[PDB]
Design a protein around this ligand. Structure first.
Ligand SMILES: O=C(O)CNC(=O)C(=O)O
Ligand SMILES: [Mg+2]
Ligand code: NI
Ligand SMILES: [Zn+2]
Length: 331
């Protein structure tokens, strides 16, 4: 069995190996990468996402979100307060202001300590889930707006044409901006490219141990759990590495830097934070191996999670028994 300890693997494809996305994902899996829940991919030195980042300031962040925390330093929830629109140039200046800028620090581990100690006492502002792309149209390898669609994958595997589309999203972050513990919608893969700026630290639980995290989360968030059997789908709960270690939950950590891809695998719970101003692009994708995970994915039917149009068909075809209840939660 490859990668039996479920370590995060780091890959360095050549330019030739970077030509066929599906093949390279399947290669990484043949080496056991999926067992971690997360892998890093360093592009060949010949590759670039676009020529420059000098022309992105006029992108609009229509609904910046202030991430306000409740709880204790290692175990908290966050809610997202809506703020007035601002451009990427305005947001970059904000991020670099004395109120929001990264503090002085020694190394990534010192900054991690500061994050966990202090996050709850501040409310950083995040631009999230902005439909769009920063890949140049002439980047032909690993261009996140030209991947195979999940609807085409389901049709190829199962035979049924379905409605829906699959496009990328941009994320503009600052120090302390946080992504809560979650798996992807319908336990899909994700791919994330850090276009520019400061790093992103990730935490991940191996897929084979996902239910351990779920059981701890029900214990640590007991009102939320009573509310919804799949409340981690609300994307609001944070648990620190110290708390996970105290409770014997298997996990790993890694820091992504600008110019690097991360891939999350089906049913890999993950969470993390940004080190300072940055811009990432991300999209969900599928392979043949995902279908069995999509059929088994939990679902939020309480009303909170509210998702993309295109989840409808995945539930309808893969989970027909759950469809009627799930759809009531959407309405
Ligand atoms: O960059 C982010 O905000 C986090 N993105 C993801 O969690 C992802 O790619 O799965
Ligand atoms: Mg612009
Ligand atoms: Ni994710
Ligand atoms: Zn719910």
């Amino acid at each position: 069995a490859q990668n039996p300890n479920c370590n995060i693997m780091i890959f360095h494809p050549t330019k030739e190996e970077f030509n066929d996305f599906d093949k390279y994902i399947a290669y990484m899996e043949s080496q056991g990468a999926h067992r971690a829940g997360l892998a890093k991919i360093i592009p060949p030195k010949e590759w670039k996402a676009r020529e420059t980042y000098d022309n992105i300031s006029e992108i609009l962040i229509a609904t910046p979100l202030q991430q306000v925390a409740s709880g204790r330093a290692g175990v908290f929830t966050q809610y997202h307060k809506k703020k007035k629109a601002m451009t990427v140039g305005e947001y970059r200046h904000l991020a670099n202001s004395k109120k929001y800028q990264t503090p002085p620090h020694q190394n990534f581990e010192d900054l991690e300590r500061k994050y966990w100690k202090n996050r709850i006492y501040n409310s950083p502002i995040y631009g999230a889930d902005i439909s769009g792309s920063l890949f140049d149209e002439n980047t032909k390898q690993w261009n996140l707006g030209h991947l195979g669609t999940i609807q085409d994958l389901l049709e190829k595997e199962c035979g049924v044409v379905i409605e829906g589309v699959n496009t990328p999203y941009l994320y503009f972050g600052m120090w302390k901006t946080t992504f809560a513990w979650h798996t992807e919608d319908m336990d899909l893969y994700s791919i994330n490219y850090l276009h520019l700026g400061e790093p992103k630290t990730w935490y991940v639980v191996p897929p084979e141990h996902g239910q351990r995290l779920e059981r701890l989360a029900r214990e640590l968030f007991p009102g939320s759990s009573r509310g919804c059997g799949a409340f981690l789908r609300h994307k609001v709960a944070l648990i620190s590495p110290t708390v996970l270690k105290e409770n014997g939950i298997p996990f790993n950590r890694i820091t992504q830097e600008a110019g690097e891809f991360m891939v999350t695998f089906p049913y890999g719970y993950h969470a993390g934070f940004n080190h300072g101003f940055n811009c990432a692009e991300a999209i969900n994708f599928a392979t043949p191996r995902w279908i069995d995970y999509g059929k088994m994915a939990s679902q939020c039917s309480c009303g909170e999670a509210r998702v993309t149009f295109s989840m409808d068909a995945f539930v309808r075809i893969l989970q027909p028994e759950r469809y009627d209840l799930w759809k009531r939660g959407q309405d």
